[PDB]
Amino acid sequence: DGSHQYPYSQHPWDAGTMPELPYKVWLLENYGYFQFQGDLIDTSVDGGSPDV
Amino acid sequence: GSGVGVSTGGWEGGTLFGDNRVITVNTRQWYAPIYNGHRYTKLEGTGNTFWKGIKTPWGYFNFNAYDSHFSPQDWQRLTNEYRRWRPKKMMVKIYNLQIKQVVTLQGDTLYNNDLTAGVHIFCDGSHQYPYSQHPWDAGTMPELPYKVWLLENYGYFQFQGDLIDTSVDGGSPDVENVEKEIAKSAPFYILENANHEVLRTGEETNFHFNFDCGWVNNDRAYCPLQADFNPLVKTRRYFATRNNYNNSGKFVYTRYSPYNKPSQWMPGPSLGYIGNTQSAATREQALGPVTVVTAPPGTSAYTAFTEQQSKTNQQSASNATWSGYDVSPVNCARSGFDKIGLAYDSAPESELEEKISIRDIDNDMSRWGQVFVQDGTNKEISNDNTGQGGNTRQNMAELKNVWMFPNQAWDSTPISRDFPIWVKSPNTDKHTLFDSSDGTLPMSHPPGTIFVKVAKIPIPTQTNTDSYLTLYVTGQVTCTIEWEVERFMTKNWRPESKNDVSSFRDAFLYTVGADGTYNTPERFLEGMPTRRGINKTL
Numbered sequence A: 001d002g003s004h005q006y007p008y009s010q011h012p013w014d015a016g017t018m019p020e021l022p023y024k025v026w027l028l029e030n031y032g033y034f035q036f037q038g039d040l041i042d043t044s045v046d047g048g049s050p051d052v
Numbered sequence B: 001g002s003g004v005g006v007s008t009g010g011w012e013g014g015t016l017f018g019d020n021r022v023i024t025v026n027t028r029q030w031y032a033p034i035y036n037g038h039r040y041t042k043l044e045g046t047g048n049t050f051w052k053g054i055k056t057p058w059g060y061f062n063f064n065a066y067d068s069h070f071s072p073q074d075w076q077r078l079t080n081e082y083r084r085w086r087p088k089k090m091m092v093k094i095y096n097l098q099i100k101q102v103v104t105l106q107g108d109t110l111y112n113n114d115l116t117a118g119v120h121i122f123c124d125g126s127h128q129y130p131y132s133q134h135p136w137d138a139g140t141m142p143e144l145p146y147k148v149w150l151l152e153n154y155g156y157f158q159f160q161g162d163l164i165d166t167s168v169d170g171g172s173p174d175v176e177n178v179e180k181e182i183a184k185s186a187p188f189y190i191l192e193n194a195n196h197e198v199l200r201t202g203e204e205t206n207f208h209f210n211f212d213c214g215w216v217n218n219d220r221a222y223c224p225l226q227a228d229f230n231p232l233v234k235t236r237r238y239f240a241t242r243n244n245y246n247n248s249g250k251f252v253y254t255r256y257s258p259y260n261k262p263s264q265w266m267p268g269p270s271l272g273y274i275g276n277t278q279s280a281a282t283r284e285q286a287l288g289p290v291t292v293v294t295a296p297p298g299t300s301a302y303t304a305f306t307e308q309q310s311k312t313n314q315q316s317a318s319n320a321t322w323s324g325y326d327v328s329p330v331n332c333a334r335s336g337f338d339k340i341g342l343a344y345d346s347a348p349e350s351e352l353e354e355k356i357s358i359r360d361i362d363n364d365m366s367r368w369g370q371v372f373v374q375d376g377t378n379k380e381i382s383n384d385n386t387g388q389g390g391n392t393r394q395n396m397a398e399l400k401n402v403w404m405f406p407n408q409a410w411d412s413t414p415i416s417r418d419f420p421i422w423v424k425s426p427n428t429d430k431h432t433l434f435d436s437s438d439g440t441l442p443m444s445h446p447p448g449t450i451f452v453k454v455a456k457i458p459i460p461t462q463t464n465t466d467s468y469l470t471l472y473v474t475g476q477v478t479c480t481i482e483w484e485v486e487r488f489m490t491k492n493w494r495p496e497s498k499n500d501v502s503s504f505r506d507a508f509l510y511t512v513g514a515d516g517t518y519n520t521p522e523r524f525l526e527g528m529p530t531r532r533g534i535n536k537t538l
Helices: B071-082 B178-185 B317-321
Strands: B015-016 B021-032 B041-044 B050-062 B082-103 B110-113 B119-124 B148-150 B152-160 B195-201 B203-209 B239-244 B251-255 B289-290 B305-306 B310-312 B325-327 B342-347 B356-358 B370-374 B397-400 B422-424 B441-443 B449-454 B471-487
Touching: B015 B071, B021 B082, B021 B449, B071 B082, B082 B119, B082 B449, B152 B178, B449 B471
Parallel strands: B021 B148, B422 B441
Antiparallel strands: B015 B021, B021 B471, B041 B050, B050 B152, B050 B449, B082 B110, B082 B203, B082 B471, B119 B195, B119 B449, B239 B251, B289 B325, B305 B310, B342 B356, B370 B397
16 A cells, blocks of 8 residues: 555554564564544444434 | 617517528517515415425516417418428527616606616526426517516525425434425525626627427328228228127127228327316415325325325325425317316406416317227126126226327327417426427427526615615517428318418407507417318328
8 A cells, every 4th residue: 555545553663573583484463453432432322313 | 889879789570481491580678677675585475385485686588488479470371381380599689778777856756877787697508597487477578569578586496385394493403304304405596606797788698599399280180090091991800799698608700890990099198187176265276187296205295194004194185285286287188178278368467357268179180089998798797607698787988097008199289379389398317208288399408598687786874784776677689589390281172271360259359459458369269279270191
């Protein structure tokens, strides 16, 4: 993704970078991304009727 | 060259009859006042009607009638000499503009000419603004070239009063309330969004338009659709007859008479509903053969209940007249009901006498009086073999309501001199066959409506409230339409019926009286209808 059209969830200071030892095998990291904030969806979100 | 003191044009008029083309030039003297005080205001019908819309500070040229374009003789010579006609291209020219100011210096009112006052003129060719012009409106171009023509105030439908009614309170948004949504999604149009010209006394403008439309047929069929055949030859077809009136029976076949032959040509569509005549005193309720209540699924129109079969809101037939809009005439190809649907007056703004004219005379035999359907034997079949007949049965019945069906052929209504020329075809996705029971020619894009308002000149006020200068515009408009015509040709030996005046009941007609009152026809024949004598081999 060169345009960064998908969430860039990579953080500095993550343990999944390229190994420093060239002879160690490198297991790629599972990708995932933030979506919503648990306590900002919390109150009165019941789907009984739309609340605009 | 140009300026305040040279005229932009001159009076053009007359007509040119030709083999392939007729060109009718007409000029009128018009004036537009200040409409509604230079403001858009919500238009609500008094009485019981749910029609609601906008009243606009604008006025418009309505060129749609025949009698405005043709004189009585130009019409007569048109209908007598030509088989069919349609418009090709129209050209309107608005010129010799004059803007006058109305000032009251004393008890008297004096009219003095204010130069440097503009007039807004806007032709909507794309129909981006609501086309609210209706055929059968009293605001068309005058038939008398010497009468001055007051343009009509423009306004348009916005929302339906009983479809905004229920629970529309603005306390909180209701997104599931559908009537709340109709009011939200109803449009509001302003003609100041559009590019348009502002003219002064020295300036002029003109507009061209190219019609794409069907024809207007002036010839009649002398023969019923089903009556055209040769009795001298015997037909090859037989008709079935049940014999013994029981289960053991079978059809026995015998040849048609040479004088009675079956046909493949059905009667054109019709609806046998004559409209409501109950002596109802309310003019704004729907009195018409077919009244149509438009309500979206979730809406409740006027007083509505839920049909428990479908669980949908429906209305009683009495309440529907409140909520609905009639369509007339629906008779279409039935000429028996010609007298029902159309009744109209020629005389505009005349409180003297009604002079209501109704279309009585149609001699065209391609339009049918009645249709009868006969479904079998006159006596119910006995369930046993042998036995004699059974309970009596209704063999024949009148078909009142004839819908569209394959192999239908008919002719449109004969039109009088004073009818509308065209009608706006809706911008809907789907359309069926175009046949108008008022004879109009529906067009996708008819001539664009020309709007006129008078430029607003403010008056400074201490209170800062809106105060405008009182002034109006008068001018001259020349409408020139080019008509595509077809001269008839026939091998008929006998003379045709030509719309002579000798058949008129009133001797003094189409002429002014002692006080200047122009005498107009109160009857449909005196309006010189089409489809009179010219015979059309079926």
